[PDB]
Design a protein around this ligand. Structure first.
Ligand code: HEC
Ligand code: HEC
Lengths: 108, 108
């Protein structure tokens, strides 16, 4: 596409150090600061039940593919102005690839 | 996204009149002129087994989302030059929406 598979192992540790603070990925895992991401690929933005999303992400109505996921992760607020997600971004494409590789796998 | 849900019923009849000639959508349905489309959303282009795809679609490496699916259907060859898919396209957004609505549902 414009996303190439990376390291799932590398990707799992990026998750623990950069996303775990606010999210879980397991099926049946809870919402924390951010929503549980189980089954996020192919779902539109703002639709997990029981979570208070911003007006913004709901309206962005993003359909989540490994490619969408990558612009997003590069600069969250630039991609969804108004988002409450407080994350600067992952500037290197290799880190992004490793992380989506992990995600695509753990959120299934 | 940039795809809004349409009529699944409308969408099923567009399929019979415009795509059925070359494709099936059921799980366990065969390849004909074109490949069986069961489970196409979220899959990349050119990966159904047992089907001879063009060099072109394999290389396009499209990741299939209701939005990708829509530019594609607008003008197949313009989107994947080299494709063997012989279909002029569906120019009206409403027809496209009805058709992807059906597809998203029947290919699951
Ligand atoms: C807390 C300081 C966060 C960190 C670190 C990360 N995310 Fe996040 N995320 C956070 C919030 C509060 C929300 C909801 C935002 C809103 O505007 O309501 C999000 C949302 C997501 C989404 C969209 C979810 C949906 O259902 O559409 C995704 C895809 C996502 N977050 C992923 C994600 C990743 C992979 C992170 C590590 C690189 C990560 N976020 C960091 C809060 C926080
Ligand atoms: C025969 C005259 C066709 C008609 C009418 C339609 N399609 Fe088709 N499709 C055809 C071929 C020969 C192929 C493979 C092309 C190649 O270059 O190898 C395709 C491919 C698809 C795809 C991509 C499949 C994949 O696995 O990536 C899709 C998504 C698709 N076709 C859908 C589709 C729809 C929805 C149609 C009706 C509007 C339709 N096609 C018409 C042949 C023919």
């Amino acid at each position: 596409t414009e996303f190439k598979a990376g390291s799932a192992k590398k990707g799992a540790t990026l998750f623990k150090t950069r996303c775990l603070q606010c999210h879980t990925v397991e099926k049946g895992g809870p919402h924390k600061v951010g929503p549980n991401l189980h089954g996020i690929f192919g779902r539109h933005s703002g639709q997990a039940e029981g979570y208070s999303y911003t007006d913004a992400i709901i309206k962005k109505n993003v359909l989540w593919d490994e490619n969408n996921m990558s612009e997003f992760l590069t600069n969250p607020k630039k991609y969804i102005p108004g988002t409450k997600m407080a994350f600067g971004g992952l500037k290197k494409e290799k880190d992004r690839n490793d992380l989506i590789t992990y995600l695509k796998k753990a959120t299934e």
